[PDB]
Short mmCIF file of N, CA and C in Angstrom, two decimals:
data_model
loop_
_atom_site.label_atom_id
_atom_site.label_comp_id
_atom_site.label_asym_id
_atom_site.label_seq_id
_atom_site.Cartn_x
_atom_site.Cartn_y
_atom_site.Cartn_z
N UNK A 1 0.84 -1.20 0.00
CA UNK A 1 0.00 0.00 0.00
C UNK A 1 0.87 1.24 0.00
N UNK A 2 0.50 2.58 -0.29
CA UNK A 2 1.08 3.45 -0.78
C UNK A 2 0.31 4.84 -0.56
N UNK A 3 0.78 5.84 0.15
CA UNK A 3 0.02 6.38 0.22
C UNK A 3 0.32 8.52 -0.42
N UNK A 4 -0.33 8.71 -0.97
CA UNK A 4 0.15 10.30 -1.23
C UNK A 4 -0.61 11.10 -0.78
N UNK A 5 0.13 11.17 0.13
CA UNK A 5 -0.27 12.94 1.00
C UNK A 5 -0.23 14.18 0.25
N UNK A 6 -1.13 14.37 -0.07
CA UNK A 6 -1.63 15.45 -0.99
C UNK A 6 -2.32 16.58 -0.21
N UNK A 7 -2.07 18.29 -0.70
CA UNK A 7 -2.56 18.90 0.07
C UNK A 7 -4.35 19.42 0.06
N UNK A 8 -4.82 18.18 -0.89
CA UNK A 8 -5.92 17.80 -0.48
C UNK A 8 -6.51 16.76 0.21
N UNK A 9 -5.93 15.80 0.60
CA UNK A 9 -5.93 14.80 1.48
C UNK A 9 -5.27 13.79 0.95
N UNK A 10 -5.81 12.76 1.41
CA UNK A 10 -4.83 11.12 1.24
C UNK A 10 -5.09 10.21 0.54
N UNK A 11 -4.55 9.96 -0.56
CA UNK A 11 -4.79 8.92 -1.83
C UNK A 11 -3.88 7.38 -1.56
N UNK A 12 -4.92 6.50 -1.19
CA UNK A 12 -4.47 5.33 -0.30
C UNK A 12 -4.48 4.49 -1.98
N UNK A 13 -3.43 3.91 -2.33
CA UNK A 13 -3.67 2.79 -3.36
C UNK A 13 -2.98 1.57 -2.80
N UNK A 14 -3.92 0.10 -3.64
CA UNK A 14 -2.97 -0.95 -3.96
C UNK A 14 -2.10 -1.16 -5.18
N UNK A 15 -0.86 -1.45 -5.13
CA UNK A 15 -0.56 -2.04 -6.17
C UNK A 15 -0.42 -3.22 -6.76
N UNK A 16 -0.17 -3.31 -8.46
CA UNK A 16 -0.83 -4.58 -8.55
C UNK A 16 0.76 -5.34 -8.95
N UNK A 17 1.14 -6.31 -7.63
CA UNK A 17 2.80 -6.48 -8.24
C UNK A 17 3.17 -7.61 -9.64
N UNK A 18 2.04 -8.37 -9.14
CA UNK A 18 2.19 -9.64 -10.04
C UNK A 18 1.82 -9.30 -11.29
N UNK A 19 1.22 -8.26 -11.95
CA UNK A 19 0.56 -7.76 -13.32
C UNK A 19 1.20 -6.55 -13.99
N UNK A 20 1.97 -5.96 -13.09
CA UNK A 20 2.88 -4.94 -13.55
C UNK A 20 4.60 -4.97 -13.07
N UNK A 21 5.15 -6.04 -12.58
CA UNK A 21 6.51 -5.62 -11.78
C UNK A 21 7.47 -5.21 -12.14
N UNK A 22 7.79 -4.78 -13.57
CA UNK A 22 8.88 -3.67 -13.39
C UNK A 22 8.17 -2.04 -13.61
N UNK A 23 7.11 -1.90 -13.40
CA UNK A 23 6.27 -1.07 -13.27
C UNK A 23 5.89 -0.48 -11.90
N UNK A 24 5.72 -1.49 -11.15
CA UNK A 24 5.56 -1.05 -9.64
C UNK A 24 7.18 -1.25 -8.84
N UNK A 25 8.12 -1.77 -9.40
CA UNK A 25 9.07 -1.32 -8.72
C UNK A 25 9.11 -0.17 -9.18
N UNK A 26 9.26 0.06 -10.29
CA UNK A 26 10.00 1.43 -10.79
C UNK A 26 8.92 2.73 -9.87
N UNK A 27 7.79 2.39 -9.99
CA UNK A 27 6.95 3.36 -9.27
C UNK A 27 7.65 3.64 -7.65
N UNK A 28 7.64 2.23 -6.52
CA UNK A 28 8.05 2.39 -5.29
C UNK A 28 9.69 2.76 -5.71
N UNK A 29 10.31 2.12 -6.26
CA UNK A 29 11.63 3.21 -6.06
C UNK A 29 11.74 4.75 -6.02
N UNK A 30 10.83 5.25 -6.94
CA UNK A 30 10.81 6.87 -6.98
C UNK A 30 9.79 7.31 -5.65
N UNK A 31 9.37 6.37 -5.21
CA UNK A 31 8.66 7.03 -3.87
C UNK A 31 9.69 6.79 -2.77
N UNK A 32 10.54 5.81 -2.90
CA UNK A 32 11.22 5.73 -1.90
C UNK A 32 12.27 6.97 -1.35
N UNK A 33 12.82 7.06 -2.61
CA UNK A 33 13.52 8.22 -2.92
C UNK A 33 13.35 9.12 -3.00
N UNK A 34 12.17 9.70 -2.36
CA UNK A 34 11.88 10.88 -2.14
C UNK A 34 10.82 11.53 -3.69
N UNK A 35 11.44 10.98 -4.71
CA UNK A 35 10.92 11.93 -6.00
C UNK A 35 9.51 12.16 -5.98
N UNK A 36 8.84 11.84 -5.90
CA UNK A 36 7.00 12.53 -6.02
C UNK A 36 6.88 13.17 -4.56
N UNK A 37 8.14 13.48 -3.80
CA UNK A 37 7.59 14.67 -2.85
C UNK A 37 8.05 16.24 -3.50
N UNK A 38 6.83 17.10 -3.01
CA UNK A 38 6.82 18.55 -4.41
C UNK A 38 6.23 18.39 -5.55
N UNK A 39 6.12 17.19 -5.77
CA UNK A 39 5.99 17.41 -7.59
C UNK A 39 4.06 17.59 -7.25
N UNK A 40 3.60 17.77 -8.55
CA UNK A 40 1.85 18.23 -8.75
C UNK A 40 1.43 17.56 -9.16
N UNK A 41 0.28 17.53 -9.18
CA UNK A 41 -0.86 17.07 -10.55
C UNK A 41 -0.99 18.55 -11.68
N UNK A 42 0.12 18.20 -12.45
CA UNK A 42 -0.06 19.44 -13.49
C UNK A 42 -0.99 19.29 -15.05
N UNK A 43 -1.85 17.87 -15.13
CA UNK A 43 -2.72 18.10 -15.98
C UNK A 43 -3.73 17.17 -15.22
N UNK A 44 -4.73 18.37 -14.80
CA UNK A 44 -6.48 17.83 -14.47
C UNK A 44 -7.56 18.44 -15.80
N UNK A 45 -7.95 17.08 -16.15
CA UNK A 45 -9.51 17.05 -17.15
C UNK A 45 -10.36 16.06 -16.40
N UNK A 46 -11.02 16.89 -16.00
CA UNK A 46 -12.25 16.46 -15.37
C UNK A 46 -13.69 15.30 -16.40
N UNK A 47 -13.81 14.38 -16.28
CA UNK A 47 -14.32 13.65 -16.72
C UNK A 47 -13.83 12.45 -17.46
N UNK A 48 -11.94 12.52 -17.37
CA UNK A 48 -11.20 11.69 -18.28
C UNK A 48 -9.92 11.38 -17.09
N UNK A 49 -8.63 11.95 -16.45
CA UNK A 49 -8.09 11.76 -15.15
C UNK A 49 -7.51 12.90 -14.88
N UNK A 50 -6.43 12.60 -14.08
CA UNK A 50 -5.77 13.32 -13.25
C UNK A 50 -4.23 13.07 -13.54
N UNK A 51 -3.04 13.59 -13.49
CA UNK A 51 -1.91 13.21 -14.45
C UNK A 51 -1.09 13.84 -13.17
N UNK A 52 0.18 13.42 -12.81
CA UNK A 52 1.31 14.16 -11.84
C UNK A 52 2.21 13.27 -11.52
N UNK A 53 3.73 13.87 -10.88
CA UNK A 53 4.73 12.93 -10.30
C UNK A 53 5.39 13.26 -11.59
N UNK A 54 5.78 14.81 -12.18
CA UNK A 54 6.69 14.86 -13.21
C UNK A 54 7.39 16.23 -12.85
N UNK A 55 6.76 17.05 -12.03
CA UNK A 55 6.55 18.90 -12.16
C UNK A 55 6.63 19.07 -10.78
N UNK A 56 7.58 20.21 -10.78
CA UNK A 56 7.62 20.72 -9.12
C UNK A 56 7.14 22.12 -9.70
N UNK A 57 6.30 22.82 -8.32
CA UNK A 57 5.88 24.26 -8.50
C UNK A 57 6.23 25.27 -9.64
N UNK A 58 5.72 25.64 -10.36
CA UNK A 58 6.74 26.56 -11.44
C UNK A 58 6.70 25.38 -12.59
N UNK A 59 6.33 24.29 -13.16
CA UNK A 59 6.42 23.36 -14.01
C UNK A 59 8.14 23.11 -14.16
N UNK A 60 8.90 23.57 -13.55
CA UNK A 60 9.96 22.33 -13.22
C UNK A 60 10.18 20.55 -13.32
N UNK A 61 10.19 20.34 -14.27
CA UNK A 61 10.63 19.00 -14.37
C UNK A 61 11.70 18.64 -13.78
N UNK A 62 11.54 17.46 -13.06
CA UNK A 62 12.27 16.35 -12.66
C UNK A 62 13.41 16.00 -13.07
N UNK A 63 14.55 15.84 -13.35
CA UNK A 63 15.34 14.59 -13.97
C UNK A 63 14.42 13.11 -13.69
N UNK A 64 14.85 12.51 -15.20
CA UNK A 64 14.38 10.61 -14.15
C UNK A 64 15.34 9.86 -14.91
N UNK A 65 15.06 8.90 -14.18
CA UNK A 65 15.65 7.29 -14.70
C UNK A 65 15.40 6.73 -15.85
N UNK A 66 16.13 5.69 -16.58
CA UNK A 66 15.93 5.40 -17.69
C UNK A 66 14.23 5.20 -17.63
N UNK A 67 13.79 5.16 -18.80
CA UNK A 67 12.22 4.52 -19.06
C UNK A 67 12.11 3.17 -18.79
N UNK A 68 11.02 2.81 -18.62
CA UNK A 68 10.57 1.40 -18.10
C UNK A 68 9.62 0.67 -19.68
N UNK A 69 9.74 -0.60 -19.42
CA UNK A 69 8.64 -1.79 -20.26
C UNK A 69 7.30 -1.17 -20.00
N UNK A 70 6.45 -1.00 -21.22
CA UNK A 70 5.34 -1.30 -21.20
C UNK A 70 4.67 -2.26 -20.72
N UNK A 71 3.97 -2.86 -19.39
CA UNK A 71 3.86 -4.03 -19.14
C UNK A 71 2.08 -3.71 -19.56
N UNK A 72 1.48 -3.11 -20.37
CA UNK A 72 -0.06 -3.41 -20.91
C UNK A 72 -0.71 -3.93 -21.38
N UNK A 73 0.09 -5.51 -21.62
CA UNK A 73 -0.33 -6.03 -22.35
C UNK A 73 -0.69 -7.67 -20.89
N UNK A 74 -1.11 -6.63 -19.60
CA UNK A 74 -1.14 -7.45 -18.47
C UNK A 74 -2.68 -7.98 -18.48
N UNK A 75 -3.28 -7.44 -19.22
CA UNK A 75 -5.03 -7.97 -19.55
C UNK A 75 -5.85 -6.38 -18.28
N UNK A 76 -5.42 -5.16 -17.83
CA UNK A 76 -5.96 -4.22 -16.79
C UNK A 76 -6.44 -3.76 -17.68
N UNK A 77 -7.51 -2.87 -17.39
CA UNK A 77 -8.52 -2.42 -18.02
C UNK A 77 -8.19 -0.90 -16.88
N UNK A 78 -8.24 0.33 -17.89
CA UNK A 78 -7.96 1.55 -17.18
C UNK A 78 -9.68 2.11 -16.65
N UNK A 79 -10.15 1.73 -15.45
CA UNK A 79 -11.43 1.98 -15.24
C UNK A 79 -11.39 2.99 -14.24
N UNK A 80 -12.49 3.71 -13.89
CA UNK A 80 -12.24 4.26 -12.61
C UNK A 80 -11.30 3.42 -11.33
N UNK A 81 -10.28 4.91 -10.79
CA UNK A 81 -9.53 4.60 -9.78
C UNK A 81 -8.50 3.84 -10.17
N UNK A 82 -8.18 2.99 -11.67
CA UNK A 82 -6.64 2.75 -11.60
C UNK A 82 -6.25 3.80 -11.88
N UNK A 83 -4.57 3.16 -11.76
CA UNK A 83 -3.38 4.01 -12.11
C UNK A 83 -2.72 3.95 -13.24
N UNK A 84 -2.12 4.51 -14.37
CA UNK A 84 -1.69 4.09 -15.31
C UNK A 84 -0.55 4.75 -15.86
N UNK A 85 0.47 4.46 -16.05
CA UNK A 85 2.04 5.41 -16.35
C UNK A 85 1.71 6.05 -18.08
N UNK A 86 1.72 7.55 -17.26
CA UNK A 86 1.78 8.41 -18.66
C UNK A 86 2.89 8.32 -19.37
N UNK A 87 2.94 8.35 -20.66
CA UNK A 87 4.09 8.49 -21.51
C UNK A 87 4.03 8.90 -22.76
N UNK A 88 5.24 8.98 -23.98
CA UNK A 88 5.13 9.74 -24.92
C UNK A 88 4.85 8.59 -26.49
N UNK A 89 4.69 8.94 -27.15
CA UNK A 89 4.24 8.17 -28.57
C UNK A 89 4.94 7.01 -28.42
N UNK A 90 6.10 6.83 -28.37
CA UNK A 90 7.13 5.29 -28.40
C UNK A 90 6.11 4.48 -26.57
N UNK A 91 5.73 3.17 -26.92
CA UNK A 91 5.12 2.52 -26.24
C UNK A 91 6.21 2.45 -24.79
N UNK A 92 7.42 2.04 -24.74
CA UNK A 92 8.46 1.50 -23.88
C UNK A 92 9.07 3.18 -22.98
N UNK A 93 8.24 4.43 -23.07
CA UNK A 93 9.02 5.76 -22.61
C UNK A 93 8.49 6.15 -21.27
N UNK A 94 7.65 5.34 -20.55
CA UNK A 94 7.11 5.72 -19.27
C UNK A 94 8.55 5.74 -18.57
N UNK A 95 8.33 7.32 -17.88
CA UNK A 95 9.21 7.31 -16.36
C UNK A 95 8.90 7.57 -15.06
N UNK A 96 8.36 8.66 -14.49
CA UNK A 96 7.40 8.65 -13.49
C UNK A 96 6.40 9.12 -13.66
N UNK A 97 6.18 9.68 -14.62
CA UNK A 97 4.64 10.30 -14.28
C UNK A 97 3.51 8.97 -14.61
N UNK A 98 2.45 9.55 -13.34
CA UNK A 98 1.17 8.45 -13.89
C UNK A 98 0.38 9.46 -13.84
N UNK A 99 -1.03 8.77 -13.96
CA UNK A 99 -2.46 9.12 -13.85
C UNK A 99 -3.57 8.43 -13.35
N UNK A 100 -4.10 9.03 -12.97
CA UNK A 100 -5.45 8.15 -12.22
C UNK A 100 -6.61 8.25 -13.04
N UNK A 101 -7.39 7.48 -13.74
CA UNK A 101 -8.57 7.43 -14.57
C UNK A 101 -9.78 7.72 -13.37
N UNK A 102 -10.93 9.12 -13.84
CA UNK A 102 -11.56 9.35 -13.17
C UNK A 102 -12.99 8.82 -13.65
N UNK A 103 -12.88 8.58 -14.87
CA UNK A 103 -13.65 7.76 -15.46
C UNK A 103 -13.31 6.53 -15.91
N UNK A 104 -14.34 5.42 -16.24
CA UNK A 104 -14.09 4.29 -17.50
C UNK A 104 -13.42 4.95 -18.82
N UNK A 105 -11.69 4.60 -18.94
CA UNK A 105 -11.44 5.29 -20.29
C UNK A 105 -10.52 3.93 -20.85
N UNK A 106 -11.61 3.55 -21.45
CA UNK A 106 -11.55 2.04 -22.24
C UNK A 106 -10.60 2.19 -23.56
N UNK A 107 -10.29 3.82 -24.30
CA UNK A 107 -9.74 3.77 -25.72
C UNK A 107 -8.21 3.95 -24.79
N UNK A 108 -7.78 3.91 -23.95
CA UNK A 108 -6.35 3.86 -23.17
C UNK A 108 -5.74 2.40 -23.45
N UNK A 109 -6.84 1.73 -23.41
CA UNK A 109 -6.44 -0.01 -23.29
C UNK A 109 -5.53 -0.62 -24.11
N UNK A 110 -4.66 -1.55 -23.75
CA UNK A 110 -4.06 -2.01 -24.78
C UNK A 110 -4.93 -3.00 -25.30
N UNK A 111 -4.22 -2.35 -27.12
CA UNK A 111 -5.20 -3.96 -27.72
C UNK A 111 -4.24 -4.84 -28.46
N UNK A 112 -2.85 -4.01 -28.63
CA UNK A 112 -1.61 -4.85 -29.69
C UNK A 112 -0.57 -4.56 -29.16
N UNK A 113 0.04 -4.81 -29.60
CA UNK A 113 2.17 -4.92 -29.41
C UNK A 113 2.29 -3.79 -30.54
N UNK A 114 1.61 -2.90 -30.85
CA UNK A 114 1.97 -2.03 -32.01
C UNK A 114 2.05 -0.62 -31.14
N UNK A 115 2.32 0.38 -32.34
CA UNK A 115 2.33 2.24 -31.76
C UNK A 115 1.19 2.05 -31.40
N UNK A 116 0.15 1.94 -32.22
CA UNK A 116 -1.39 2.67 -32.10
C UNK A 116 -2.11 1.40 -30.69
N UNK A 117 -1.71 0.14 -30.76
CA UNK A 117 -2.33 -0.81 -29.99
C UNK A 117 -1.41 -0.47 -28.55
N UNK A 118 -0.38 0.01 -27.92
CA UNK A 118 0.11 -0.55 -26.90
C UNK A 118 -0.72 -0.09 -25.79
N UNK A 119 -1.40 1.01 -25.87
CA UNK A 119 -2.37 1.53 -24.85
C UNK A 119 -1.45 2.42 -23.45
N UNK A 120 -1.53 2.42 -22.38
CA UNK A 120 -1.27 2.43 -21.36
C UNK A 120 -1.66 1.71 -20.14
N UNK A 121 -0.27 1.15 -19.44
CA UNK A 121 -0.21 0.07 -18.75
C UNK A 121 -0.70 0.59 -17.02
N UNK A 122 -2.00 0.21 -16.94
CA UNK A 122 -2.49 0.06 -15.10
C UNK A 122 -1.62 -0.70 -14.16
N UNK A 123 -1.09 -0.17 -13.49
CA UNK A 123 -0.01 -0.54 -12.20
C UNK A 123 -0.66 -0.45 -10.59
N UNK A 124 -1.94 -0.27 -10.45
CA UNK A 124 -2.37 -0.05 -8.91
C UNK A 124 -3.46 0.57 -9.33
N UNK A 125 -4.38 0.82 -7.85
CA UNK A 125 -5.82 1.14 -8.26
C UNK A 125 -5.72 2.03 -6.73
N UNK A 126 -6.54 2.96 -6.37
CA UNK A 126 -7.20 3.42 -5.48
C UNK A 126 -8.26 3.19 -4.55
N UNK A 127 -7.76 2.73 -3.40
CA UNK A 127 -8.28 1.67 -2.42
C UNK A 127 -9.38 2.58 -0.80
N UNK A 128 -8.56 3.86 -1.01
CA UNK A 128 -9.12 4.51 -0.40
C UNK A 128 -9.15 6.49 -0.85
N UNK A 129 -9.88 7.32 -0.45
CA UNK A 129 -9.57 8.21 -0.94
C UNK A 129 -9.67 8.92 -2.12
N UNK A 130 -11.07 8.16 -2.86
CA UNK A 130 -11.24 8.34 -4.15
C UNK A 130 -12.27 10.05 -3.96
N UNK A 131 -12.47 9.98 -2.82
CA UNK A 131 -13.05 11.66 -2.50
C UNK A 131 -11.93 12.81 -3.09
N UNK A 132 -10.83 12.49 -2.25
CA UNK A 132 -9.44 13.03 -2.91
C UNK A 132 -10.00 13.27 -4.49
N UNK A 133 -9.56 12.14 -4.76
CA UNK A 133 -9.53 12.26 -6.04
C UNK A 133 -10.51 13.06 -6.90
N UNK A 134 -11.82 13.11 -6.29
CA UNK A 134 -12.72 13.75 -6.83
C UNK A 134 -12.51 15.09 -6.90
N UNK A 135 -12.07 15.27 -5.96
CA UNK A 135 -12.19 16.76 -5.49
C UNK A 135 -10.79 17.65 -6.19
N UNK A 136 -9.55 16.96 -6.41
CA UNK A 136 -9.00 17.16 -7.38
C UNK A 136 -9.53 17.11 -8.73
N UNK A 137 -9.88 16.78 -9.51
CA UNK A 137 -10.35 16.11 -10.75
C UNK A 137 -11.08 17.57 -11.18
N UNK A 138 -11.24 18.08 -10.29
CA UNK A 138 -12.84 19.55 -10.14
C UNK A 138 -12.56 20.23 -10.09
N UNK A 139 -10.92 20.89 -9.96
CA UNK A 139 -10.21 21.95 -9.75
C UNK A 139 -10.09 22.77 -10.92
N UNK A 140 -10.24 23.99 -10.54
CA UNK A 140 -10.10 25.50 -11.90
C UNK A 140 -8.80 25.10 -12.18
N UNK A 141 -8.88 24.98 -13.65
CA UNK A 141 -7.49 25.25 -14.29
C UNK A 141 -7.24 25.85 -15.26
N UNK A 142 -6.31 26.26 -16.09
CA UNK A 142 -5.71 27.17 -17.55
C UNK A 142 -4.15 26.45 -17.79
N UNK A 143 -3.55 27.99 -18.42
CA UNK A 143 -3.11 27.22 -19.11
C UNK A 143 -0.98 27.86 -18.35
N UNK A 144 -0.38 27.36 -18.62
CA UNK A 144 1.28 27.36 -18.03
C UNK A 144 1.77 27.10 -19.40
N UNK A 145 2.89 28.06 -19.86
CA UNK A 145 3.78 27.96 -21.43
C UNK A 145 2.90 26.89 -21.93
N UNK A 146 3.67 25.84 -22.75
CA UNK A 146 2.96 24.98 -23.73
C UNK A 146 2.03 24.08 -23.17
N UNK A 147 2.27 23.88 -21.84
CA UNK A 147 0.95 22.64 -21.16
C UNK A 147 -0.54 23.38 -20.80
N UNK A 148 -1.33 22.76 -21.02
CA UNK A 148 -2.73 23.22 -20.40
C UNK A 148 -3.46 22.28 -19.91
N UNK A 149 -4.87 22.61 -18.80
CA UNK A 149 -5.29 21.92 -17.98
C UNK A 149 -4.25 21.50 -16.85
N UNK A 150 -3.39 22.44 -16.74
CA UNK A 150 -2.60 22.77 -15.21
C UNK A 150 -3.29 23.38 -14.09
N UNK A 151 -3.51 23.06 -12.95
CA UNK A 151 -4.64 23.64 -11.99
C UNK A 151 -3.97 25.32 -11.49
N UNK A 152 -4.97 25.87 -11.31
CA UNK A 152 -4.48 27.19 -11.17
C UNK A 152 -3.76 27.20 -10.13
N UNK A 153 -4.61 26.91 -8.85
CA UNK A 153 -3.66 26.33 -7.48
C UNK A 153 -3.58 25.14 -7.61
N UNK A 154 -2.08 25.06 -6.99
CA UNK A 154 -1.17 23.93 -7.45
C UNK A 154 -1.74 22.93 -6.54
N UNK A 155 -1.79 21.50 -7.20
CA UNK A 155 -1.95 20.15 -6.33
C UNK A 155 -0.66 19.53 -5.92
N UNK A 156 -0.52 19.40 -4.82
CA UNK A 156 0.72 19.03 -4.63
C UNK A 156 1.07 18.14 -3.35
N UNK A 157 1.30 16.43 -4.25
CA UNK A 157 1.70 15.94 -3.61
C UNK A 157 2.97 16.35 -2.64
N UNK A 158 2.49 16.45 -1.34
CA UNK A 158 3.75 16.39 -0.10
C UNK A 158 4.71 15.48 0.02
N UNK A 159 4.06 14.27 0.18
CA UNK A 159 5.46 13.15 0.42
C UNK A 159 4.16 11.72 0.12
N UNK A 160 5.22 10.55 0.35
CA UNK A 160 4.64 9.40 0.19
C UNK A 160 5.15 8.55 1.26
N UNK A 161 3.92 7.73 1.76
CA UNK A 161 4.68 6.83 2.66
C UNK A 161 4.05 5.62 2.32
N UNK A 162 5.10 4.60 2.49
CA UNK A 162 4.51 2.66 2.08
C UNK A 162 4.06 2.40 3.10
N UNK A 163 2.91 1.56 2.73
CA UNK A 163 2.74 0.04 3.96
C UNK A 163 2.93 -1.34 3.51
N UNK A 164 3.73 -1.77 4.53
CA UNK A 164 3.81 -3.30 4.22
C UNK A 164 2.87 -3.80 5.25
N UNK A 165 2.69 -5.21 4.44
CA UNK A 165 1.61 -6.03 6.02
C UNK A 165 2.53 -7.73 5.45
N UNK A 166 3.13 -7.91 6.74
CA UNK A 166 3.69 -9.04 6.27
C UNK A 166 2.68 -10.28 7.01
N UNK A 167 2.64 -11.67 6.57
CA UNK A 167 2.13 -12.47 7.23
C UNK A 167 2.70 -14.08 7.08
N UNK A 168 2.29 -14.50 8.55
CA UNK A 168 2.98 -16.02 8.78
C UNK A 168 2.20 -16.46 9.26
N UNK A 169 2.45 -18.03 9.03
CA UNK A 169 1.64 -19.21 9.16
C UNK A 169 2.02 -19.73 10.72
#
């Protein structure tokens, strides 16, 4: 479990390890490490998701780590409350940024191993805190240099903290 303290409240997710794992490591390493503390949700469209974990205040980008595998071809379906790693035209370029689907957005899905089929790959879902989410999702926004649908006041994840729950027989 995983949680982002946001300065609208607390976005509790599971992740999904067995259906995404070099996807959800790559995700908990950059939480470990501090990186999605500061950064925003710098593109909210309300009725489609919520996008952040790339941009510190001022649209400051990040440095990141090499890109990660497309793992979308795990059979997830991007429905309300998953998570899904944003990225650029080449299928294999996700680095940290994700998004949270605030709706059913079924044309995300993967349907091939191709450009146009690879879709975007769901890594965790939202287990608690989908109020959060709402209430982000609803926020006034415009527009910052070339990006738009940046919230006017900034969303901004604070920090992240894990839970483990270990168990024995």
């Amino acid at each position: 479990m995983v949680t982002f303290h946001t300065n609208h409240g607390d976005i509790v997710i599971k992740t999904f390890d067995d259906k995404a794992p070099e996807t959800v490591k790559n995700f908990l390493d950059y939480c470990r490490e501090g990186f999605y503390n500061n950064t925003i949700f710098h593109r909210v469209i309300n009725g489609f998701m919520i996008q952040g974990g790339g941009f510190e205040p001022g649209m400051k980008q990040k440095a990141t780590k090499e890109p990660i595998k497309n793992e979308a071809n795990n059979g997830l379906k991007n429905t309300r409350g998953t998570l899904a790693m944003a990225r650029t035209q080449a299928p294999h370029s996700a680095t940290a940024q994700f998004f949270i689907n605030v709706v059913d957005n079924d044309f995300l899905n993967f349907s091939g191993e191709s450009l146009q089929g690879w879709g975007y790959c769901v890594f965790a879902e939202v287990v608690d805190g989908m109020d959060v989410v709402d209430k982000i999702k609803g926020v006034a926004t415009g527009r910052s240099g070339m990006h738009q649908d940046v919230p006017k006041e900034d969303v901004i994840i604070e920090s992240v903290t894990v839970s483990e729950h270990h168990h024995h027989h």
